[PDB]
Design a protein around this ligand. Structure first.
Ligand SMILES: Cc1cc2nc3c(=O)[nH]c(=O)nc-3n(C[C@H](O)[C@H](O)[C@H](O)COP(=O)(O)OP(=O)(O)OC[C@H]3O[C@@H](n4cnc5c(N)ncnc54)[C@H](O)[C@@H]3O)c2cc1C
Length: 353
């Protein structure tokens, strides 16, 4: 059991969560403690130890129900991955167990550093037994719910470091984004870090490599998660469109019998299949396949959502299709925008024999 559980946990409440702009805190801790939202974490740390396909299809299913909830899973998973990819033995042992005993967020983006991550100015300064982080992050997903804030920044010598900061450490202020356009219940919030003091142990080991590499390591997850999340959006759109198409009648027959509508259904099904295949391929493998999966799944999900909205018409004008339309648009922008994905994939192709 896993998807069935989420179908009923969600069980017809996504619309209200979306319009109210918030997810139940109790649900997230419950899922976190169950190891879900963190499924790929090794069993040694109390994780479920799921592979990329298993966790991926699970992420896709949650995405098909509520993308705000799905976004929390991506943030959770990304934080966990970042710590187990950079942290040491003691660091991974401490943080990973907490992320699977019931919340974290990952903030690297800044007002002046969006697509250009190397433009962030937040600084982390090791000073004896203590680290001092000072900066500001924007649009941090799930930050309004997090206990831990995984913050990226520049050291001093070897620029680029990552620090796990307790949400309640004096000097930190998490200001929720007022009116987010999509994934409205994901708890987006800007982070204000005014001279925050934390143990030197909070700074993950390997926090000495360049700005890229790090971030690139964390973005690998997230891009994979967002890609599967988009497969979920396509699932919800395809199923809602087909349901409307074989039940709604106009001009004396089910909409599905009108070839133009059939065409939309075919394109929705095809989009869903394409996104799944690319996600599966990336999950098997690596960096380019993941960028590719996120890119295609996102663009196809955005197109699919518009197509599904067309099919449902006034009935979809709340709604899974309504939310998919707004949510998918955002997916084309985050975790490496469509434009950045094109520049990166272009660079990849231009380096092939
Ligand atoms: C719902 C949501 C959740 C988010 N969650 C997080 C999170 O958890 N953590 C986090 O750190 N950030 C998060 N972000 C922000 C996400 O990282 C951003 O979408 C991205 O960095 C947005 O940058 P924006 O900076 O100003 O702009 P840019 O100002 O980056 O936007 C630029 C526009 O110009 C294009 N562009 C920029 N440079 C180039 C170029 N060289 N070539 C071609 N086109 C270019 C872009 O593709 C884009 O369309 C989230 C955002 C949203 C909307």
């Amino acid at each position: 059991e896993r998807d069935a559980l989420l179908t009923d946990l969600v069980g017809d409440r996504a619309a209200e969560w979306d319009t109210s702009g918030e997810l139940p805190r109790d649900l997230l801790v419950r899922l976190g403690a169950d190891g879900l939202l963190c499924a790929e974490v090794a069993a040694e740390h109390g994780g479920l130890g799921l592979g990329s396909r298993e966790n991926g299809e699970f992420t896709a299913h949650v995405g098909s129900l509520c993308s705000s909830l799905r976004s929390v899973m991506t943030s959770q998973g990304m934080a966990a991955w970042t710590v187990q990819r950079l942290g040491d033995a003691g660091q991974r042992a401490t943080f990973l167990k907490e992320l699977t005993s019931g919340l974290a967020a990952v903030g690297f983006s800044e007002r002046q550093a969006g697509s250009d991550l190397s433009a962030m100015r937040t600084r982390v300064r090791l000073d004896g037994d203590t680290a001092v982080v000072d900066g500001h992050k924007v649009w941090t997903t799930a930050a309004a719910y997090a206990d831990h804030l995984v913050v990226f920044g520049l050291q001093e010598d070897g620029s680029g470091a990552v620090v796990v900061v307790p949400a309640d450490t004096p000097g930190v202020r998490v200001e929720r984004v007022p009116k987010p356009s999509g994934c409205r219940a994901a708890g987006h919030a800007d982070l204000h870090l005014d001279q925050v003091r934390v143990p030197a142990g909070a700074v993950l080991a390997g926090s000495g490599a360049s700005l890229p590499m790090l971030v690139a390591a964390s973005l690998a997850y997230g891009r994979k998660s967002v890609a599967w999340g988009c497969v979920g959006i396509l699932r919800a759109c395809r199923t809602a469109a087909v349901a409307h198409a074989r039940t709604r009648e106009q001009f004396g027959r089910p909409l599905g019998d009108h070839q133009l509508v059939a065409g939309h259904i075919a394109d929705l099904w095809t989009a869903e299949q394409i996104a799944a295949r690319v996600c599966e391929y990336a999950s098997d493998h690596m960096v380019p396949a993941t960028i590719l999966a996120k890119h295609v799944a996102a663009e196809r999900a955005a197109a699919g959502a518009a197509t599904a909205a067309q099919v449902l018409a006034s009935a979809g004008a709340g709604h899974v299709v309504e939310r998919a339309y707004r949510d998918a648009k955002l997916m084309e922008i985050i975790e490496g925008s469509s434009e950045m994905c094109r520049v990166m994939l272009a660079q990849h192709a231009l380096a092939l024999p």
